[PDB]
Amino acid sequence: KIEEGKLVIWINGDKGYNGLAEVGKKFEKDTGIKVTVEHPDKLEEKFPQVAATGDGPDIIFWAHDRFGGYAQSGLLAEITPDKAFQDKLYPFTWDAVRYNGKLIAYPIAVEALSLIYNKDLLPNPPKTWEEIPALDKELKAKGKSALMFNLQEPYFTWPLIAADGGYAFKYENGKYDIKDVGVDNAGAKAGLTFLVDLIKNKHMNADTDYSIAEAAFNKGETAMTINGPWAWSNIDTSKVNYGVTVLPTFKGQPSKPFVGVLSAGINAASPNKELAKEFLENYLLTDEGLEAVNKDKPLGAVALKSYEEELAKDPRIAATMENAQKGEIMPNIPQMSAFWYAVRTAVINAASGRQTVDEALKDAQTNSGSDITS
Amino acid sequence: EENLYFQGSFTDGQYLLKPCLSHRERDFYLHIKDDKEWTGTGIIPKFYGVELHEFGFGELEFIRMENLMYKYKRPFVLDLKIGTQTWDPETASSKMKKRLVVDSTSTTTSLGVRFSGMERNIGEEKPILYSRYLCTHEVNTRDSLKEYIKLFFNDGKKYRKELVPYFISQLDKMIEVMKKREYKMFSSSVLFVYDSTTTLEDKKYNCKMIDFAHNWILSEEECTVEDGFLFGLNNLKSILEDIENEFKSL
């Protein structure tokens, strides 16, 4: 029961929703079409529930991984940007919004982990993971640590695990092969082994989580952390002199973070699809549209080339895009939930010492292929 | 039922997370969690509790169970489905015809036990898997079932005849509990496992009743149809006794 002749947009409360509303007011001034931006609690849960009825927002904003499940249930309309429009956004961002061969959302922002370092403690941060043990030794003697980051969540630990050849599902032929999982190959074992040795050798603590690591870095206790652009404003409040840079290499190969793409999908039940396309292509995805949003709450890096080129004068943004391009788009397929469970479990079990790396990743291989259709 | 026991299950070190397809299995483990005849006798896997887990479509219910093959290097696995029928009062009429066929063409009707799948890890090769579908043509007599059970005890080099007494002792314990006729169990199994690297110093073998998705708690609910469970256990024991005698010449 979506009302015709208006646009209702759903976006999360930590985004620049007042900025997006200003873009909505500009749209209303030109078209006479009222745009209402809302930020309800747990909208990512509400949307699939409410959209199944055939009601809810015309446009929904969320990370692209979640939109695959939405498109599986047929809740998202196929978008129709012409060739000219597609050329305005970075090619890899379009790969992130493709599901069953069709485009199902407009890319808005690009997020990826980077190495965040304290310039005062470490003006020349390490280029390799291999030099961190020696660096920690030096820093401990001065009363600090080298590196603290969230070890509890595989999103944060995966970039090292994937570096020397680990992967989630083989991508080729425009398709993910869910029977070909790369969590238990030589590369994944090498990466996880290095991570566990860091703990064995007292350079990291197995129990370090998001909150502990963030507090420590922002208080000047540790020289480095690994985090995304969402974390920068807390560091800004802390008065630590920090930089953001390329992740360290492992065995001469780049760390490979998963790339998240904030995307705007169109409700398949919306009777305002043409209105939504005009809004998204010609109002939001312009320098002026993204600026309005960015001014309210920063987007980090963006998919729109023209505006990204302005933002990338900030080296933290340049770093984010660099790491993103060395990483991999996060797969959007249902089986990713099994993969995430698998890697989470394996890292905790290996890091705790109750399983060896080989034992833990053997179970990860099995778990990744578990038949999650209940 | 159609629902293979390990399908959708997760491994977490010494635990498995087993998805709840209905409440019957969960309710059974909760019902016996304080009963010594079940929990102190080593005849079912240890139960640790119910847990909710999100897998990208909403929270699913799982029960946390003992992983019977924890740290097994070369696993050997045999699943035998127990009972004289594998349907119950809740079985869909659309699925009834097939159950009736398979129950009679397999050894289910005649023995109350049938072959349900096997895995053998026979050195450094990929595992050899033996499908449940063998039961309706290749393992459809007492003699062939006995031969396939002997193959389970064949580690690739020798028959592990020293393990057979353990399996008989386990069946005896199951018989003693099931004599009380407090439950009806349809399509449940006895799982046989060992690690071929097992030694006297590191014992790695197990025999457990599993898969209680069609268990009826007779004190709480009526079920008039017979399961033939005790009949199945007795026939399985008889086969193991025959194997023990046949292995004496080794």
XYZ file of C-alpha atoms in Angstrom, chain A residues 12-238:
227
model
C 20.066 4.252 8.908
C 20.220 6.738 11.813
C 24.029 7.006 11.730
C 23.897 8.350 8.137
C 23.465 11.979 7.021
C 19.667 11.791 6.815
C 19.171 15.550 7.323
C 21.484 16.131 4.344
C 19.521 13.619 2.255
C 16.305 15.456 3.251
C 17.794 18.682 1.819
C 18.297 16.837 -1.496
C 14.668 15.721 -1.095
C 13.554 19.347 -0.637
C 15.409 20.339 -3.818
C 13.575 17.513 -5.628
C 10.229 18.743 -4.244
C 10.955 22.330 -5.378
C 11.454 21.157 -8.994
C 8.846 18.384 -9.247
C 6.213 19.175 -6.600
C 6.810 15.656 -5.241
C 7.181 15.427 -1.469
C 10.179 13.410 -0.279
C 10.183 12.014 3.270
C 13.421 10.684 4.750
C 12.981 8.366 7.754
C 15.475 6.525 9.981
C 13.534 3.813 11.856
C 15.204 1.351 14.229
C 16.361 -1.926 12.674
C 15.065 -0.947 9.223
C 17.199 -3.686 7.626
C 15.004 -6.178 9.503
C 11.766 -4.231 8.972
C 12.241 -3.805 5.191
C 12.130 -7.494 4.190
C 9.137 -7.970 6.525
C 7.210 -4.878 5.443
C 8.184 -5.041 1.729
C 6.870 -8.626 1.525
C 3.379 -7.215 2.210
C 3.985 -4.687 -0.584
C 4.407 -1.647 1.691
C 7.347 0.308 3.146
C 9.843 2.638 1.469
C 10.242 3.487 -2.209
C 14.017 3.596 -1.730
C 16.156 1.761 0.827
C 19.807 2.556 1.646
C 22.050 -0.248 2.996
C 25.317 -2.140 2.419
C 25.181 -4.200 -0.799
C 25.698 -7.617 0.838
C 22.243 -7.342 2.461
C 20.577 -6.425 -0.867
C 21.293 -9.875 -2.359
C 18.867 -11.438 0.132
C 16.367 -8.672 -0.641
C 16.673 -9.423 -4.383
C 16.419 -13.166 -3.717
C 12.957 -12.563 -2.234
C 12.087 -10.275 -5.193
C 11.855 -7.137 -3.052
C 14.066 -4.936 -5.273
C 13.358 -3.541 -8.740
C 15.863 -3.863 -11.558
C 17.452 -0.443 -12.132
C 17.972 0.946 -15.633
C 20.898 3.377 -15.753
C 22.022 4.041 -19.339
C 25.647 3.644 -20.439
C 26.461 7.307 -19.836
C 25.343 7.122 -16.201
C 27.201 3.860 -15.558
C 30.426 5.542 -16.768
C 30.081 8.150 -13.950
C 30.631 5.475 -11.241
C 33.668 3.244 -10.636
C 33.188 -0.071 -12.498
C 33.827 -2.241 -9.424
C 30.935 -0.588 -7.555
C 28.503 -1.878 -10.216
C 29.790 -5.440 -9.686
C 28.649 -4.957 -6.062
C 25.003 -4.256 -7.022
C 24.587 -7.065 -9.556
C 22.449 -10.069 -8.527
C 21.499 -12.920 -10.872
C 23.000 -10.848 -13.716
C 20.822 -7.757 -13.148
C 21.585 -4.426 -11.475
C 19.456 -4.039 -8.331
C 20.743 -0.843 -6.666
C 22.710 2.367 -7.169
C 26.152 2.464 -5.507
C 26.586 5.449 -3.154
C 29.627 4.998 -0.882
C 32.595 2.636 -0.634
C 34.037 1.380 2.656
C 37.088 -0.719 3.455
C 39.483 -1.211 6.355
C 42.791 0.642 6.467
C 45.821 0.766 8.759
C 45.363 3.631 11.225
C 48.559 4.693 12.970
C 49.737 7.161 15.605
C 52.197 9.565 13.939
C 53.780 10.505 17.237
C 54.506 6.953 18.219
C 55.288 5.660 14.735
C 55.991 8.205 11.995
C 57.049 5.428 9.596
C 54.443 2.668 9.926
C 55.424 -0.811 8.704
C 54.766 -1.929 5.128
C 54.728 -5.620 6.059
C 53.036 -7.761 8.696
C 56.375 -9.581 9.096
C 58.036 -6.567 10.754
C 55.331 -6.080 13.406
C 56.786 -8.539 15.946
C 60.114 -6.663 16.003
C 58.246 -3.350 16.102
C 56.146 -4.475 19.071
C 59.326 -5.519 20.916
C 60.744 -2.020 20.420
C 57.505 -0.314 21.469
C 56.896 -2.508 24.547
C 60.331 -1.431 25.802
C 59.042 2.156 25.547
C 55.780 1.263 27.324
C 53.442 0.940 24.323
C 52.190 -1.754 21.944
C 52.422 -1.921 18.145
C 48.965 -3.096 17.155
C 45.495 -3.562 18.646
C 42.426 -4.370 16.588
C 39.188 -6.330 16.886
C 40.079 -10.036 16.802
C 36.548 -11.199 17.659
C 34.967 -10.490 14.278
C 36.234 -12.132 11.040
C 35.604 -8.923 9.037
C 38.729 -7.526 10.735
C 40.957 -10.637 10.676
C 40.138 -11.803 7.119
C 42.340 -9.274 5.267
C 45.476 -11.034 6.591
C 43.996 -14.517 6.089
C 43.165 -13.759 2.430
C 46.502 -12.042 1.626
C 48.512 -15.148 0.677
C 45.578 -16.787 -1.176
C 42.559 -17.244 1.118
C 39.126 -16.552 -0.398
C 35.433 -17.078 0.454
C 33.779 -18.352 -2.771
C 35.438 -18.638 -6.182
C 34.296 -15.841 -8.517
C 34.377 -16.373 -12.275
C 31.897 -16.325 -15.188
C 30.212 -13.436 -13.329
C 29.238 -15.998 -10.692
C 30.187 -17.283 -7.235
C 30.835 -21.018 -7.072
C 29.675 -21.991 -3.559
C 31.249 -25.474 -3.931
C 34.689 -23.840 -4.260
C 35.643 -22.333 -0.883
C 39.142 -21.029 -0.096
C 39.211 -20.970 3.708
C 41.444 -24.030 4.071
C 44.124 -23.566 1.387
C 47.855 -22.882 1.883
C 47.271 -19.110 1.868
C 44.534 -19.093 4.520
C 46.604 -21.394 6.735
C 49.630 -19.103 6.331
C 47.659 -15.984 7.254
C 45.880 -17.475 10.262
C 49.145 -19.032 11.446
C 50.808 -15.611 11.418
C 47.867 -14.156 13.363
C 48.014 -16.921 15.989
C 51.793 -16.604 16.356
C 51.314 -12.886 17.081
C 49.188 -13.984 20.043
C 51.521 -16.856 21.045
C 54.452 -14.413 21.058
C 52.565 -11.843 23.140
C 52.261 -9.178 20.416
C 48.454 -9.368 20.527
C 45.825 -10.581 23.007
C 43.188 -13.114 21.891
C 40.446 -11.254 23.796
C 40.948 -7.848 22.146
C 37.615 -6.589 20.779
C 36.280 -3.507 19.002
C 35.798 -1.448 22.138
C 39.123 -2.330 23.807
C 41.134 -1.662 20.633
C 39.364 1.649 19.899
C 39.806 2.967 23.446
C 43.498 1.962 23.472
C 44.329 3.612 20.157
C 42.363 6.768 20.978
C 44.225 7.074 24.312
C 47.660 6.754 22.680
C 48.377 3.301 24.182
C 49.011 1.481 20.893
C 50.762 2.640 17.710
C 48.345 1.074 15.230
C 44.822 -0.182 14.795
C 42.819 -1.556 11.858
C 39.469 0.104 11.232
C 37.209 1.826 8.709
C 36.082 5.408 8.074
C 33.217 5.060 10.543
C 35.863 5.172 13.315
C 37.567 8.440 12.296
C 35.289 10.890 14.131
C 35.999 9.241 17.512
C 39.746 9.505 16.821
C 39.211 13.166 15.874
C 37.661 13.846 19.290
C 40.619 12.117 20.998
